[PDB]
Structures are given as structure tokens and as C-alpha cells.
Design an enzyme around this catalytic site. Sequence first.
Site, PDB file in Angstrom:
ATOM      1  N   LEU A   1      33.841  41.984  26.435  1.00 21.05           N
ATOM      2  CA  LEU A   1      33.617  40.543  26.633  1.00 21.05           C
ATOM      3  C   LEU A   1      32.430  40.254  27.570  1.00 21.05           C
ATOM      4  O   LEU A   1      31.777  39.201  27.474  1.00 21.05           O
ATOM      5  CB  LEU A   1      34.907  39.891  27.169  1.00 21.05           C
ATOM      6  CG  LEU A   1      36.087  39.982  26.185  1.00 21.05           C
ATOM      7  CD1 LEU A   1      37.352  39.441  26.785  1.00 21.05           C
ATOM      8  CD2 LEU A   1      35.750  39.254  24.873  1.00 21.05           C
TER       9      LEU A   1
ATOM     10  N   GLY B   1      28.320  44.107  33.724  1.00 24.44           N
ATOM     11  CA  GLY B   1      27.266  44.103  34.724  1.00 24.44           C
ATOM     12  C   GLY B   1      27.004  45.519  35.186  1.00 24.44           C
ATOM     13  O   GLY B   1      27.405  46.476  34.522  1.00 24.44           O
TER      14      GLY B   1
ATOM     15  N   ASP C   1      29.239  31.590  42.310  1.00 26.06           N
ATOM     16  CA  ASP C   1      28.795  32.092  41.003  1.00 26.06           C
ATOM     17  C   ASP C   1      29.096  31.102  39.879  1.00 26.06           C
ATOM     18  O   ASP C   1      29.350  31.507  38.752  1.00 26.06           O
ATOM     19  CB  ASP C   1      29.492  33.425  40.699  1.00 26.06           C
ATOM     20  CG  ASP C   1      28.700  34.326  39.746  1.00 26.06           C
ATOM     21  OD1 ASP C   1      27.475  34.158  39.587  1.00 26.06           O
ATOM     22  OD2 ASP C   1      29.322  35.221  39.139  1.00 26.06           O
TER      23      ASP C   1
END
Length: 293
Positions: A29, A32, A142
Amino acid sequence: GDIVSEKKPATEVDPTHFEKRFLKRIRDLGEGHFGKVELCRYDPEGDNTGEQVAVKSLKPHIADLKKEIEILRNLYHENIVKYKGICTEGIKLIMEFLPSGSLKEYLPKNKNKINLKQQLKYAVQICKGMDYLGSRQYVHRDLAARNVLVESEHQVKIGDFGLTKAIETDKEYYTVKDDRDSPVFWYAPECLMQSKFYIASDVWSFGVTLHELLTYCDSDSSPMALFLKMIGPTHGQMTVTRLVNTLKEGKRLPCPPNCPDEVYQLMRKCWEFQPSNRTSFQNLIEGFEALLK
Ligand SMILES: CC(C)(C)OC(=O)N[C@@H]1CC[C@@H](n2cnc3cnc4[nH]ccc4c32)C1
């Protein structure tokens, strides 16, 4: 006499403990440099009828993940993604799976379905989730369309808390040290210039996320693309200083195409240079609600 053994105590099932052996990968999905989120089926019956779950892991940072798990486990809000449990020995975070994915995936594919009214409704829900987070003394750090999940055509949820920090009681901000992989084109000046993160800094990031929502997350109109046009795309390690200068000069992301000025003005109130001059999440909610009725 006979071998002595331990009296087996009455074992109970913990519905938040997911066994490694039944957690079966389907696909990625997201990922990083330190981790990934995968689509798995938890399939204890082994017949492909088990529940689909989202699973956040680390690549072969543990402490931060454990902290992330503990934050999410204790967040309860209709616009925040649901914690389901953990898988351990190392640890994995198990979350409800939202098949529509993030706004980054969903919006480009669903423009015909999602009009201004629905965009504003998403904006309110994002604001409600964020105001709840601020009420628990957290700064998200974020907020971006890639971290907003689509539960349905009518509902979004904040879907990642990997950078979330607690602001100390009686303090206004959190100071960060680990800043290499910062989403700088979403960051307020105080974040960029001093690594100080206020609730107001999340408001700034929300304004940029609102700009994304309003452009249907088109890559050619992304905050990164537009800023790099404004400042220059080949400055390397001078990028942030040039970003800061541009913001100091009062330059901001432009009004998205087809976005009414009254919506753009709510967006601009997220981007006051000084944190104390910015709108609040509650005032944003009120403002969008006034536009919706
Ligand atoms: C970069 C890193 C690996 C640390 O994290 C992510 O990629 N996070 C993204 C935020 C949302 C995640 N995601 C994408 N589609 C999803 C669908 N359902 C989900 N449930 C919980 C997260 C989640 C989903 C991926």
C-alpha cells in the site's frame, strides 16, 4: 513419582493480537526508506475468507513505531483510521484497510463523482480529525493528501501517524531533531527555520492539503511542482532556504482552478507567516460549514 508439569491456566483470546502465521501478504500500500504498509489478509481458517487488514512494518526506528502504535491505539474518532492490533516476535501495526486508498490515489480517478460540495465536506472532516488530535495534545507533522484515506465517497480519515509528537503540557510546541526526510513543501516557516512544531503548524499543512484536494491531487499541480516552479527546480541543498525566502516575501501557492475566492481565502488564513495569526481548525470548520449552507 510422575513428571511434574504446569497447571494450564484458562487461556483467553486477545482480538488485538494477530499471529504471524495467519497474516498473509497480498500487496504493498506504501513504502519509504525505513518501512512499508502492506495489504494482508488475516486468514486463520486458511480459506481466503479472513479479514483484509493494513499492516505497517519496518524494513530489516522500532522505538518510533512502538510510539506510533501507542498513539493510534488510543485515538478514537470517526475521521481517524482504526487501530486493530499488533503482530509481534520486532512489531507490526495492524489497521483497518480502506480499499479506496489515499486521496492521492482516489481523487484523480473520481473527479466526476466528487464536486466542490463533497471536497468541502472532506475538508471539514479532516479539520475535525485534526482538532481531535490537537485536543489530545498532539502535533501531526505530516498532514498531506497521501496520508488522508477515503472510507467512502462521503467520508475520509487521517491514515498515518508516523511523525506525530506530543506537545508537553504548558508548552506551545515540540522541537524535532530527526529532520532529514521532512515534507518541506507542506511545512510552515517555523518548522523550516527552527524545527518548532505548533498546532498552528498543522493548520499550515492543512491549507496545503486543502490545495491538493482542490486540485484532485494532480501531480503537475502538486505543492512540490508548484513551489519548485516558484523558486527553481535545480538548487539542491539551497532548496529550503529559497523556499523560506519565497514565503518571507509573502508568496504562496496560487488559487486552484475552479476554486471560489471565498474558499481560497480560508486557505490563505492557514498560511499567515506567524503561527499566532493563523486560523484555527474550529474556525475553518465554521467557515466551510457557512459555505456549505
Ligand atoms: C511511508 C510509510 C511506509 C511509513 O507509510 C505509508 O506509506 N503510509 C501511507 C499512509 C496510508 C497508507 N495506506 C494506503 N492505502 C491504505 C489503505 N488502508 C489503510 N489503513 C491504514 C493505512 C492504509 C493505507 C500508506
